[PDB]
Amino acid sequence: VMDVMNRLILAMDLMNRDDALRVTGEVREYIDTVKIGYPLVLSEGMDIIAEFRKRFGCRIIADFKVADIPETNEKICRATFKAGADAIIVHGFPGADSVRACLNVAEEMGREVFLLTEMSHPGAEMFIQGAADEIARMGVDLGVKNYVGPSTRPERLSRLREIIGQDSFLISPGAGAQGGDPGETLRFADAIIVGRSIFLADNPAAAAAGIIESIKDLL
Amino acid sequence: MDVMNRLILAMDLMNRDDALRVTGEVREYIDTVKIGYPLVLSEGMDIIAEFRKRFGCRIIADFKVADIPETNEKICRATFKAGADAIIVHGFPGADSVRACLNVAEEMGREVFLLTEMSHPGAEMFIQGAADEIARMGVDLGVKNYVGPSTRPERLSRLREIIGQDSFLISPGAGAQGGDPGETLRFADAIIVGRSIFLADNPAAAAAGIIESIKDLL
Ligand SMILES: O=c1cc(O)n([C@@H]2O[C@H](COP(=O)(O)O)[C@@H](O)[C@H]2O)c(=O)[nH]1
Numbered sequence: 001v002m003d004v005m006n007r008l009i010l011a012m013d014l015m016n017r018d019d020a021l022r023v024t025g026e027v028r029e030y031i032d033t034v035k036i037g038y039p040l041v042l043s044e045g046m047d048i049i050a051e052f053r054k055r056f057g058c059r060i061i062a063d064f065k066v067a068d069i070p071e072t073n074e075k076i077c078r079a080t081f082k083a084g085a086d087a088i089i090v091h092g093f094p095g096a097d098s099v100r101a102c103l104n105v106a107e108e109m110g111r112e113v114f115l116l117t118e119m120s121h122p123g124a125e126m127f128i129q130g131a132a133d134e135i136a137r138m139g140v141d142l143g144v145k146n147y148v149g150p151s152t153r154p155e156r157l158s159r160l161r162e163i164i165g166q167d168s169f170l171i172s173p174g175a176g177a178q179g180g181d182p183g184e185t186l187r188f189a190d191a192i193i194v195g196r197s198i199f200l201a202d203n204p205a206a207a208a209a210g211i212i213e214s215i216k217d218l219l
Numbered sequence: 220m221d222v223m224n225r226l227i228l229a230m231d232l233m234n235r236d237d238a239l240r241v242t243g244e245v246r247e248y249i250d251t252v253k254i255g256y257p258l259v260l261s262e263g264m265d266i267i268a269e270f271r272k273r274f275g276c277r278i279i280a281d282f283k284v285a286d287i288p289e290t291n292e293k294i295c296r297a298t299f300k301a302g303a304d305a306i307i308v309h310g311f312p313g314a315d316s317v318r319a320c321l322n323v324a325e326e327m328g329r330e331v332f333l334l335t336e337m338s339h340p341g342a343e344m345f346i347q348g349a350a351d352e353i354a355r356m357g358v359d360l361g362v363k364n365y366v367g368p369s370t371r372p373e374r375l376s377r378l379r380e381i382i383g384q385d386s387f388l389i390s391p392g393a394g395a396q397g398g399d400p401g402e403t404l405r406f407a408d409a410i411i412v413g414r415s416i417f418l419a420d421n422p423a424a425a426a427a428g429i430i431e432s433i434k435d436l437l
């Protein structure tokens with residue numbers, strides 16, 4: 001599994017290249033893994049991955065929540081890995097063929113797939129939550145090794161950890177701005193994803209350092 | 220939305236030169252292009268403005284938006300800034316995620332299309348069982364534009380029943396995935412067609428042929 005420094009992944013969802021680069025640079029001593037999603041990519045282009053690699057050397061998880069038919073999923077994964085992403089996040093709710101398409105490209109290209117199981121926001125309760133245990137079980141059956149589950153629902157995160165086993169890698173968004181607790185979340189997740197409570201802080205480095213201090217016994 | 224010939228081109232070629240050339244070859248037949256991540260991630264969001272400059276076609280950004288509300292708002296803002304007229308949003312992540320997109324679309328003078336059931340086999344696993352409820356949710360939220368599957372006309376018909384005849388319904392899966400254009404247009408206002416056109420030996424002839432096969436429906 002990837003070795004995530006300080007069990008902390010920055011969600012870099014600022015949409016301005018200069019701000020995104022500044023903040024990431026300021027927290028680089030604390031974090032060696034950055035999640036780049038569509039807010040930044042659709043604003044600044046896929047080259048932003050290259051620019052982060054050039055500037056920081058951080059691992060890059062492309063949070064693209066891939067959610068199309070197998071044919072299109074393959075093309076998205078190819079484009080994303082060609083651009084230099086280490087890993088891509090894929091939705092499980094569109095089913096096994098759609099996930100398999102992503103796994104096939106990742107295998108061919110020597111990269112990683114993360115399977116998003118349950119989501120952290122309130123709306124996740126409407127449809128995703130009821131499917132999430134089965135989505136995780138499907139992931140295990142397909143050979144998925146990396147997963148995403150919600151900090152906002154520790155009870156659900158705990159169940160998802162059980163399903164995927166202790167050897168699987170699990171990352172978790174929702175701590176901070178969405179109300180999740182870093183320490184509680186790290187009982188189950190290998191690493192926490194944190195966005196706004198770092199990148200909107202007056203001092204993002206201090207914010208990251210503070211989170212790390214609060215979980216220091218867990219490192 | 221008024222779609223010429225009830226035919227929306229899914230431009231999923233990844234090379235700018237090829238995408239522009241093939242679109243140009245079929246431009247007389249369409250006035251609506253669906254641009255997705257295969258093209259956008261290969262050539263950048265500037266491709267949308269380029270299509271508008273060259274073709275003056277309407278642009279549907281097929282981004283299958285499927286994040287939390289905060290992120291969905293950012294995605295929609297970036298997408299509409301690039302000149303998309305509409306965006307396709309998944310319903311499976313729930314009402315708040317859809318509402319986030321509706322809010323931005325209203326602010327920027329654009330449309331949201333709600334994807335209910337998908338066309339591929341894996342849609343049967345989780346999406347199909349939720350799809351009627353996703354459609355009802357769309358109705359409750361005031362969604363007027365929907366996407367459902369050419370590959371399952373009984374499901375497409377049910378989706379039409381739920382949303383009513385006043386709603387606008389577009390449908391992928393005709394051609395390459397096995398759907399039939401004419402049958403699909405019994406229920407959908409327009410069909411989305413990708414590979415059957417853009418991978419054809421002669422894309423213009425492929426488009427012309429499809430339109431000929433549905434001429435009585437135009
Ligand atoms: O269930 C999920 C899955 C996610 O990827 N995310 C992502 O994780 C990040 C959370 O950021 P924040 O710490 O600002 O709430 C965002 O990039 C969001 O898109 C999430 O919030 N919930």
Ligand SMILES: O=c1cc(O)n([C@@H]2O[C@H](COP(=O)(O)O)[C@@H](O)[C@H]2O)c(=O)[nH]1
Nearest residue numbers: 069072229337338391395396412413414
């Ligand atoms: O359920 C759906 C929803 C889609 O947007 N699509 C999209 O519609 C297009 C179908 O292309 P094609 O005609 O080559 O099968 C692709 O861009 C695909 O991503 C789909 O196939 N099924």
